Design a protein around this ligand. Structure first.
Ligand code: A0V
Length: 358
């Protein structure tokens, strides 16, 4: 009596559409996948000044959602026997052999527990030589493996090592191995010249057009750009890893395994994981200022839930992202915007929508 696509569109109109007026967001793409059926909704503008509408070809910056691809690459490397997560970075980047950072293992780098790595590198660290010097000069502070501090250089180094173990630069690991194994045709570390017309402007807090800056180990930490249909296919792969060849299948499953907890949030590789059903507050608590910006002592997982859900937020100066999936209900959602909006508004809108869909 109302077809499913219109029902889902109404729910997205009720929950996501009013964020555009509220936060003055020029463009948004929202997608839902349910049982192998894809629903794409597009709003507004990819470029205000060009009058170019958001559409299925629009390329957005994923920000930290990029960490999911880095995690998947690490899982691919591990399950191919190219790395072990108990290895240290000096085994692959030989100039770090026997330095203090070589006491930190790959898993601890992927999951932000070195005990002394902050959200960003210092501004001055830009070149490959400066990055190396930075890690050579690094010294411990907190006990290794016990304190989570969410960190671009931590998972950046992880990404770098993964690339070294596969004998390819990190951009090539994604663009030539991992994106094609996931079936993504419109995802990039470096958007090529012939695709730049599809690359949206981001918009800052004064609605001024901006794009992400080049940075040290930017690609593995926050450097991937993709379209809505590609992101939906990524969510499809996470929902149905058993439909992919062994190597990328094991890779995807590797990203799902929780390693530790901070209260109700289980840190997997890239993904944050929760006991399902999850309350809205549990999901909101995961991205509190205290969790995101400060050190938190981790605990051993002492209740492993049978059924989980998984999410990740991403932001660049000019773009917001949120991806969530619930294997049990065979359903997932992607939101891409070309202006940041509060993490709380993303998580809540997707919660309402996903819980309402018949
Ligand atoms: B990632 O995109 C990393 N990130 C966020 C910021 C910021 O707030 O400026 N800098 N780096 O996003 P997140 O915090 O995991 O959603």
């Amino acid at each position: 009596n109302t077809p499913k696509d219109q029902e889902i569109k109404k729910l997205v109109d009720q929950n996501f559409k009013p964020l555009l007026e509220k936060y003055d967001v020029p463009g948004m793409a929202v997608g839902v996948i349910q049982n192998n059926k894809k629903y794409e909704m597009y709003y507004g503008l990819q470029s205000v000044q060009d009058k170019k509408a958001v559409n299925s070809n629009t390329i957005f910056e994923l920000g930290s959602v990029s960490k999911l691809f880095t995690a998947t690459a690490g899982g691919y490397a591990k399950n191919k026997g190219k790395i072990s997560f108990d290895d240290t970075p000096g085994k692959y980047w030989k100039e770090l052999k026997n330095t203090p950072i070589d006491q930190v293992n790959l898993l601890q780098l992927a999951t932000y527990t070195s005990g002394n790595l902050a959200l960003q590198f210092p501004d001055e660290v830009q070149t490959d030589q400066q990055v190396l010097t930075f890690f050579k000069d690094w010294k411990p502070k907190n006990p290794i493996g016990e304190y989570r501090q969410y960190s671009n250089p931590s998972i950046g180094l992880f990404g770098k090592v993964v690339a070294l173990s596969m004998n390819k630069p990190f951009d090539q690991v994604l663009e030539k191995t991992i994106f094609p194994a996931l079936g993504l045709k419109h995802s990039y570390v470096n958007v090529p010249k012939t695709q730049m017309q599809n690359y949206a402007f981001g918009y800052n807090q004064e609605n001024q057009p901006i794009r992400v800056n080049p940075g040290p180990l930017d690609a593995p930490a926050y450097g991937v750009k993709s379209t809505l249909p590609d992101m939906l296919s990524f969510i499809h792969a996470n929902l149905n890893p058993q439909k992919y060849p062994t190597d990328i299948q094991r890779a995807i499953n590797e990203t799902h395994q929780g390693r530790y907890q901070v209260n109700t949030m289980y840190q997997a590789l890239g993904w944050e994981e929760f006991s399902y059903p999850a309350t809205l507050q549990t999901l909101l608590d995961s991205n509190s200022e205290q969790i995101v910006m400060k050190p938190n002592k981790v605990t051993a997982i002492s209740k492993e839930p049978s059924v989980k859900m998984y999410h990740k937020t991403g932001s660049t100066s000019g773009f917001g992202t949120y991806v969530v999936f619930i294997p049990k209900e065979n359903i997932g959602l992607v939101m891409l915007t070309n202006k940041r909006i509060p993490n709380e508004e993303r998580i809540k809108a997707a919660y309402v929508v996903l819980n309402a869909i018949k």
